[PDB]
Amino acid sequence: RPNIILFMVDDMGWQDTSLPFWTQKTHYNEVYETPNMERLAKQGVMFTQAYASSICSPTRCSLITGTNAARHRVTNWTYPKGQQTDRPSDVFNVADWNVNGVCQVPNIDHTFQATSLAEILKDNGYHTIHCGKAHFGAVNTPGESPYHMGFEVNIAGHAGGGLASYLGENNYGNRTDGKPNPWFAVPGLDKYWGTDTFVSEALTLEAIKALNHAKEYNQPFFLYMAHYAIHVPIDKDKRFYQKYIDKGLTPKEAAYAALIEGMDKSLGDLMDWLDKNGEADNTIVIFMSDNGGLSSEPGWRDGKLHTQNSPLNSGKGSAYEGGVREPMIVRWPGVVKPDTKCDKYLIIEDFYPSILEMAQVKHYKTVQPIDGISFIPLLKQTGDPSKGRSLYWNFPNHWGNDGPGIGPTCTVRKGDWKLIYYYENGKKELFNIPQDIGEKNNLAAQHPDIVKHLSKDLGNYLRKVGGQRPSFKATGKPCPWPDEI
Amino acid sequence: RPNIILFMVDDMGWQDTSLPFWTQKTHYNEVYETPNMERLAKQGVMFTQAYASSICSPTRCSLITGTNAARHRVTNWTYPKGQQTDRPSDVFNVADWNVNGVCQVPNIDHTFQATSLAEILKDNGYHTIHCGKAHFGAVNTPGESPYHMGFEVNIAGHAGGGLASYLGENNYGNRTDGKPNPWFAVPGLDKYWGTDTFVSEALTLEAIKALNHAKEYNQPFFLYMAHYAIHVPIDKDKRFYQKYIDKGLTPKEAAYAALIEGMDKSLGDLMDWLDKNGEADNTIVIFMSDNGGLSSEPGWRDGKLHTQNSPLNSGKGSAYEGGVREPMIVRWPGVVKPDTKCDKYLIIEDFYPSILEMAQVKHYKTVQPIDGISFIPLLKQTGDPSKGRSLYWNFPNHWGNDGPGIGPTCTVRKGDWKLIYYYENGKKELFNIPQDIGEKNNLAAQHPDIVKHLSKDLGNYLRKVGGQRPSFKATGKPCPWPDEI
Numbered sequence: 001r002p003n004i005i006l007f008m009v010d011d012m013g014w015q016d017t018s019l020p021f022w023t024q025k026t027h028y029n030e031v032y033e034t035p036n037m038e039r040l041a042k043q044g045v046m047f048t049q050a051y052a053s054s055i056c057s058p059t060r061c062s063l064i065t066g067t068n069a070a071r072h073r074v075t076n077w078t079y080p081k082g083q084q085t086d087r088p089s090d091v092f093n094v095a096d097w098n099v100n101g102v103c104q105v106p107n108i109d110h111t112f113q114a115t116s117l118a119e120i121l122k123d124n125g126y127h128t129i130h131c132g133k134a135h136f137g138a139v140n141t142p143g144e145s146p147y148h149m150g151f152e153v154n155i156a157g158h159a160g161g162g163l164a165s166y167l168g169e170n171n172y173g174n175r176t177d178g179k180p181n182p183w184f185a186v187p188g189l190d191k192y193w194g195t196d197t198f199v200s201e202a203l204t205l206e207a208i209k210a211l212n213h214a215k216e217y218n219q220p221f222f223l224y225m226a227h228y229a230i231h232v233p234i235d236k237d238k239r240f241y242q243k244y245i246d247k248g249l250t251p252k253e254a255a256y257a258a259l260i261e262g263m264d265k266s267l268g269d270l271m272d273w274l275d276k277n278g279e280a281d282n283t284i285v286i287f288m289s290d291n292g293g294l295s296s297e298p299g300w301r302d303g304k305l306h307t308q309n310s311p312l313n314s315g316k317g318s319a320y321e322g323g324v325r326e327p328m329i330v331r332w333p334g335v336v337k338p339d340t341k342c343d344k345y346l347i348i349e350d351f352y353p354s355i356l357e358m359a360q361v362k363h364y365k366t367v368q369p370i371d372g373i374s375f376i377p378l379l380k381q382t383g384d385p386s387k388g389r390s391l392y393w394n395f396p397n398h399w400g401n402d403g404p405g406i407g408p409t410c411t412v413r414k415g416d417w418k419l420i421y422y423y424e425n426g427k428k429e430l431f432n433i434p435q436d437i438g439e440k441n442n443l444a445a446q447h448p449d450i451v452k453h454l455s456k457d458l459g460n461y462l463r464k465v466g467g468q469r470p471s472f473k474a475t476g477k478p479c480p481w482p483d484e485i
Numbered sequence: 486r487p488n489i490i491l492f493m494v495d496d497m498g499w500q501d502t503s504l505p506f507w508t509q510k511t512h513y514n515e516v517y518e519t520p521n522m523e524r525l526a527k528q529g530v531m532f533t534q535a536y537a538s539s540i541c542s543p544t545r546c547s548l549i550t551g552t553n554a555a556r557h558r559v560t561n562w563t564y565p566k567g568q569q570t571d572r573p574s575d576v577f578n579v580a581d582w583n584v585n586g587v588c589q590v591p592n593i594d595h596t597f598q599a600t601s602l603a604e605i606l607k608d609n610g611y612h613t614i615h616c617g618k619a620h621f622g623a624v625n626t627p628g629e630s631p632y633h634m635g636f637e638v639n640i641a642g643h644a645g646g647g648l649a650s651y652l653g654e655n656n657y658g659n660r661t662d663g664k665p666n667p668w669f670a671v672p673g674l675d676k677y678w679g680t681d682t683f684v685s686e687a688l689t690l691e692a693i694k695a696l697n698h699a700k701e702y703n704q705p706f707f708l709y710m711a712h713y714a715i716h717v718p719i720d721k722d723k724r725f726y727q728k729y730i731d732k733g734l735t736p737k738e739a740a741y742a743a744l745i746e747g748m749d750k751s752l753g754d755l756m757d758w759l760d761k762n763g764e765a766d767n768t769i770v771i772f773m774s775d776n777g778g779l780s781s782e783p784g785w786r787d788g789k790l791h792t793q794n795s796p797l798n799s800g801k802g803s804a805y806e807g808g809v810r811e812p813m814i815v816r817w818p819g820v821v822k823p824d825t826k827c828d829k830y831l832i833i834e835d836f837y838p839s840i841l842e843m844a845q846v847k848h849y850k851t852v853q854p855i856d857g858i859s860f861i862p863l864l865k866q867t868g869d870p871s872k873g874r875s876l877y878w879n880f881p882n883h884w885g886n887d888g889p890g891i892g893p894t895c896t897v898r899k900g901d902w903k904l905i906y907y908y909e910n911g912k913k914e915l916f917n918i919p920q921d922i923g924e925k926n927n928l929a930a931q932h933p934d935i936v937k938h939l940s941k942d943l944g945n946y947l948r949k950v951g952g953q954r955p956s957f958k959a960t961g962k963p964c965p966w967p968d969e970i
C-alpha cells in the first residue's frame with residue numbers, strides 16, 4: 001500500500017509555473033522557475049484541464065468531503081463564526097450558505113456534516129499528517145481542527161485561510177505583546193519566530209520532521225502538504241527576489257515569482273527526502289492548486305488587469321477558466337506512464353474517491369453522498385470519466401473585487417460547452433472551451449439549443465443536490481434558476 | 486448526553502487522601518488534605534473496593550482498551566521502543582510481553598491492537614480531550630500519541646510515564662542549551678518554563694482553556710484529566726510544603742502531602758469551572774488512581790517501609806491490596822445518590838464499557854474482546870456485576886524493587902477469597918480480604934479445597950485469554966501455571 005502525498009498550493013494559477021500546461025510556452029512560463037514541477041512531470045502525468053472552484057473554501061471542502069460545492073454550500077471563504085464574509089451588494093442578498101464550513105459531527109449550525117477523507121484513511125491504517133493551510137471550518141467550530149478532521153499530526157493548520165505574513169521576522173503575524181493576534185497568524189512555528197525562515201521553508205522543515213517520524217511506524221502515510229504559499233500578502237522571499245529583478249520583472253511580479261520558486265523548492269525538498277529515504281517508488285505524489293491566480297487586484301500584480309493567468313480569462317473568484325483551471329501532476333511509479341499528458345477533464349471532488357482507491361479502501365461508509373468520480377481510469381489509461389460528464393459550479397455569493405466572470409454565478413461544463421449563468425441580471429454566456437480557451441467569444445446567441453439544454457442540466461442539478469441561489473433586495477424574490485428565464 | 490471527566494491520579498494510594506475509604510479514619514486521613522475529594526464524595530458515591538493493576542502501564546492500557554492486563558500483555562511499564570524495562574534476573578526470563586504498548590493499527594511489532602475508548606466516544610460525537618500522563622505506547626510507536634488513540638486535543642501527553650521535574654523553574658525537565666532531552670521531560674507547557682508554576686497547576690490551567698474552547702462546540706466532551714502527580718521525584722510544592730512541616734511531618738512526608746493537596750486543588754478547580762459555566766448538572770466526574778502508592782523506597786517515604794498504604798499491605802508493584810486497591814469516586818447528578826458508598830468490587834478494564842454506557846453509546850464494535858464489565862448497575866443500584874465474578878491480575882515480569890507481594894505473580898480474587906501465585910518458586914498465598922485487609926494471615930493450609938479451585942480458575946483464564954508466564958533459566962522450561970503445582 002503506497003504512501004500518498006497531496007501537495008496543494010494556494011491560489012496558484014494554470015500558468016504560475018515554468019511547466020507549460022498549454023500547447024506552447026507562455027510569457028509566464030518563460031520567467032517563472034519551477035524545476036521540481038518539471039522533474040515531477042517527467043516522472044508522471046500532467047492534467048491540462050483539471051478543475052477546482054474559484055475560491056479556497058468551496059474547493060478544499062469538496063476535497064475533504066468529496067461533495068460538489070453546490071451541495072455542501074461552503075461556497076465562499078470562511079473564518080468568522082456565524083457570519084457571512086460576502087461583500088455587500090446593493091442588488092442581491094447572498095445565499096444562506098454554510099458560513100462555518102464542514103465537520104464530522106451533527107448539529108453544528110451552518111455546517112455540512114461529512115465523513116472526512118482523512119478519517120477514512122486513518123481508520124483504514126494510514127498515518128495522517130496535515131501541514132499548512134487547513135481552512136475547513138470557521139473559528140470555534142469543530143472543523144477548525146485538522147485533528148477533528150482525522151489528521152493524527154497537525155502542523156500550522158487552523159481555521160485561517162490566509163496568513164498575516166511569510167516572514168519569520170514578523171513571527172508570521174504572531175504578537176509578542178498582549179496584543180490580540182490577527183486571524184491569520186500562523187500557529188505552530190513558534191520555534192522560527194524572529195529568525196529569517198520564510199514560512200514556506202518552515203512548513204517544509206516541519207513536514208520533513210513529520211515524515212522522518214512516520215518512518216518509525218509500520219503503516220503507510222498520507223501527507224497533506226497544503227502551502228499558504230502565494231496567497232496574499234506577497235511578501236518578498238529574499239532567497240530569490242533579486243534574481244527576478246535582475247530578470248527585468250517589476251517588484252510586484254518579482255515578489256510573486258519568488259513565492260512560486262519557494263513553493264517549488266518545497267516540492268523538491270520533499271522529493272529529495274523520498275529519494276534519500278527509499279520511499280520514492282512506493283509513494284504517490286499529487287500536485288494541485290485550489291483556485292486560479294489572483295488577477296483582480298492591481299496592488300499585487302502588474303500587467304493588464306485580469307490577464308495574469310494568460311491565455312485564460314480572469315482568475316481567482318471568477319467562473320472563467322482563469323479562476324477554476326488548475327495545474328495538476330500525479331506521479332505513481334509502476335502505474336502511471338512517466339512524461340505523459342492527459343487532457344480529459346476532472347474536478348476537485350474527484351480527489352476524494354480517487355485517493356481512497358489509491359489507498360486500497362473499498363466500500364467505505366460515509367454519512368454524505370459522494371459526488372466525486374474516481375479518475376484512476378485516466379491515471380491507468382483504461383477509461384474516460386469525462387465522457388458525457390457534466391461539471392458544476394455554484395457561487396451564490398459576493399467576493400471582494402470586480403471583474404470578468406466574477407459575481408454570483410453558476411456554471412455547467414459538458415463536453416466542449418461551458419454555460420455560465422449570472423444570477424444578478426439573468427445573463428448567459430456560452431463558450432466552446434477547446435476553440436476559445438480565453439473565453440473571448442460568447443456563442444449564446446448562435447446556439448440557443450445548447451443554451452436551453454445546458455440550463456436545464458444546471459438547474460436540475462442545483463435543485464437536486466440542494467444548491468442555493470441569491471435573492472433580490474428590491475422584491476424579496478429569489479433570483480431565477482438558469483432554466484427559469 | 487452528559488459530559489464526562491475522568492480524573493486519574495498517578496501512583497496514588499488507597500489512603501493518600503483525607504477522605505476515609507476504610508471503615509475507620511486512619512492517621513494518613515488525619516494528616517492529608519483533600520477537601521475537594523470530600524466535597525465530590527458528599528455529592529456522589531465512593532467505591533471502597535476498586536482495583537487497578539499494580540503498575541501504570543497495565544492499568545492505563547486496560548482502561549483505554551477494555552481488556553484485562555493478562556490479555557493485552559502490556560504487563561510492566563513501557564517507554565523504550567522494542568526493549569524490556571524489566572530488572573534482570575539470574576533465576577528467570579520474563580514473558581515476551583508487549584513492551585511497545587497498545588495502538589489502534591495492526592502489524593506494530595510488540596503491541597496489542599485495540600479499538601480505543603476515545604475513538605468510540607469521538608466517533609459517536611464527543612469532543613475528546615487528553616491532559617497529562619498518557620503512557621499508552623512506547624516512544625516512536627503509534628500509541629505514543631493521544632491523537633492516534635482518538636483524542637482531538639492533547640495537552641502534555643506522550644510516551645513518558647514519569648516526569649523529570651514538577652518545577653516550571655526546571656522547565657519540567659526540558660533542556661534549552663543543546664539537544665539531549667530526558668525521556669520524561671513534559672511537553673506542551675513551554676509558556677510556563679522559567680515560572681514558578683507547579684506542573685499540576687499548569688495542567689489544570691491548560692485543561693481549563695481546553696474546556697472553555699469546548700463550550701464553543703455544540704457537542705458533549707470527554708476530558709481525560711490524567712495527572713503526573715503524585716509520581717516520583719517528590720518535588721516540593723512551596724504552596725503547601727511548609728504547612729505540613731508545621732503540622733509536624735518529616736520533610737519527605739511533607740513533600741508527599743503537598744503533592745496530594747495540589748492534585749486536590751486541581752480537582753477543585755475543575756469542579757468550580759463546572760459550577761461557574763453551568764455544566765455541573767450534566768457532567769459525570771470519575772475520580773480514580775492507577776495503582777498503589779510507592780512504598781518500596783525509603784529515600785522518598787518515611788515510616789515503616791512497605792506500610793505507606795496502611796492498613797493495606799505494601800504498595801506499588803505488589804499484588805497485595807496496597808498495590809491494587811484505588812480510591813474511586815463518581816458524581817453523576819440525578820443518577821447517583823449523593824454521599825453513598827459501594828462495597829462491590831470492580832476492576833479498571835470495567836471503566837471502558839461503563840464510560841461508553843454513560844455516553845449512551847448503545848452499540849459499538851471493537852477489534853479486541855472487551856473483558857471489562859459495566860459497573861453502571863452499581864451506580865444505579867439495579868444489579869451486581871460483582872456476584873460470582875472472578876478478578877484477575879498477571880505480572881510475569883520483574884519490577885525494579887523487592888517487597889511484600891512484589892515479583893512475578895498472577896492473582897485471582899473471587900468473593901471473599903484472593904489467591905496469589907508466585908512464579909519464582911510456586912508459593913501460593915490465600916487471604917480472606919474482608920477478614921484480613923492487611924493480608925497478614927495466609928490461609929492456604931487451612932483451605933486446600935479453595936487453593937486448588939482458585940488455582941484452576943486462574944490457570945484456565947490465563948490460558949484462555951492468551952496470558953503469559955516467565956520461564957526458568959536452569960531448565961529453560963516455562964514456570965508452572967498455578968494449576969500445575
Ligand SMILES: [Ca+2]
Binds near residue numbers: 010011055056290
Ligand atoms: Ca485558494
Ligand SMILES: [Ca+2]
Binds near residue numbers: 540541
Ligand atoms: Ca502509576
